[PDB]
Amino acid sequence: DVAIVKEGWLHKRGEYIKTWRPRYFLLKNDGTFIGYKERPQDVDQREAPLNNFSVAQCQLMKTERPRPNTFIIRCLQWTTVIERTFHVETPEEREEWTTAIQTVADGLKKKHRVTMNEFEYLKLLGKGTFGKVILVKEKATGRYYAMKILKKEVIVAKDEVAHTLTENRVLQNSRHPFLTALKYSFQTHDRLCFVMEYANGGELFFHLSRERVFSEDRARFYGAEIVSALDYLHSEKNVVYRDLKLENLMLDKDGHIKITDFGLCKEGIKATMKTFCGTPEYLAPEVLEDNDYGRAVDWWGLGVVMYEMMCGRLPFYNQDHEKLFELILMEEIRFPRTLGPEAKSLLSGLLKKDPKQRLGGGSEDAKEIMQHRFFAGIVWQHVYEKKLSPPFKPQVTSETDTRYFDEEFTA
Ligand SMILES: CCC(=O)Nc1ccc2[nH]c(=O)n(C3CCN(Cc4ccc(-c5[nH]c(=O)c(C)nc5-c5ccccc5)cc4)CC3)c2c1
Task: State how far the alpha carbon of 284 is from the alpha carbons of 81, 297, 405, in Å.
Answer: 21, 6, 32
Instruction: Tell me, in angstroms, the distance from the centre of ligand 1 to residue 258's CA.
Output: 15
Three-state secondary structure call for residue 285 = helix
Instruction: Tell me, in angstroms, the distance from the centre of ligand 1 to residue 78's CA.
Output: 8
Q: Which one, of 115, 159, 152, 113, lies nearest residue 136 by Cα?
A: 115
Domains (range + CATH), the chain: 1-112 (2.30.29.30), 113-202 (3.30.200.20), 203-411 (1.10.510.10)
Instruction: Tell me, in angstroms, the distance from the centre of ligand 1 to residue 278's CA.
Output: 14
Helical (H) or strand (E) element with 307: helix 296-311
Of all atoms in ligand 1, which is nearest to the CA of residue 266? 4
| Helix/strand/coil percent split, the chain, to 5 | 35, 25, 45
List of residues 6+ apart from 173 with CB closer than 8 A: 236, 237
Three-state secondary structure call for residue 333 = coil
Cα–Cα distance measured from residue 334 to residue 315, given in angstroms and rounded to the nearest whole number: 8
Experimental method: X-ray
Task: State how far the alpha carbon of 368 is from the alpha carbons of 230, 284, 336, in Å.
Answer: 13, 19, 25
Q: Are 235 and 365 in contact (CB under 8 A)?
A: yes
Cα–Cα distance measured from residue 27 to residue 101, given in angstroms and rounded to the nearest whole number: 7
74 secondary structure, DSSP code: E
Q: What are phi and psi of 295, to 5 degrees?
A: -60, -20
335 lines ligand 1 (CB under 6 A): no
**411 CB neighbour count, 10 Å cutoff:** 6
Question: HEC states along 4-73?
Answer: EEEEEEEEEECCCECCEEEEEEEEECCCEEEEECCCCCCCCCCCCCCHHHECCCEEEEEECCCCCCEEEE
Three-state secondary structure call for residue 381 = helix
- In 32-190, where do the E strands start and end? 33-36, 58-63, 70-77, 80-87, 119-128, 131-138, 144-151, 182-187
List of residues 6+ apart from 24 with CB closer than 8 A: 7, 8, 9, 10, 35, 36, 37, 38, 39, 40
Cα–Cα distance measured from residue 84 to residue 33, given in angstroms and rounded to the nearest whole number: 11
Which residue among the candidates 1, 42, 243, 261 is catalytic per the annotation?
243
Q: Which one, of 276, 283, 324, lies nearest residue 304 by Cα?
A: 283
Distant-in-sequence contacts of 89-95, Cβ < 8 A, 24+ apart: 93/8, 93/69, 94/62, 94/69, 94/70
241 lines ligand 1 (CB under 6 A): yes
- In 188-284, where do the E strands start and end? 191-197, 249-251, 257-259
Residue set of the binding site: 12-17, 21-23, 51, 84, 125-133, 148
Residue from 34, 236, 265, 275 whose mutation best tests the ligand 1 pocket (most atoms within 8 A of CB):
265
Residue set of the binding site for ATP: 125-133, 148
Q: What are phi and psi of 144, to 5 degrees?
A: -95, 145
Verify whether residue 243 is a known catalytic residue. Answer: yes
Cα–Cα distance measured from residue 80 to residue 84, given in angstroms and rounded to the nearest whole number: 13
- How deeply is 97 buried, as exposed, middle or buried, from its count of CB atoms within 10 A (0-12, 13-18, 19+)? buried
Instruction: Tell me, in angstroms, the distance from the centre of ligand 1 to residue 238's CA.
Output: 12
162 secondary structure, DSSP code: H
- How deeply is 338 buried, as exposed, middle or buried, from its count of CB atoms within 10 A (0-12, 13-18, 19+)? exposed
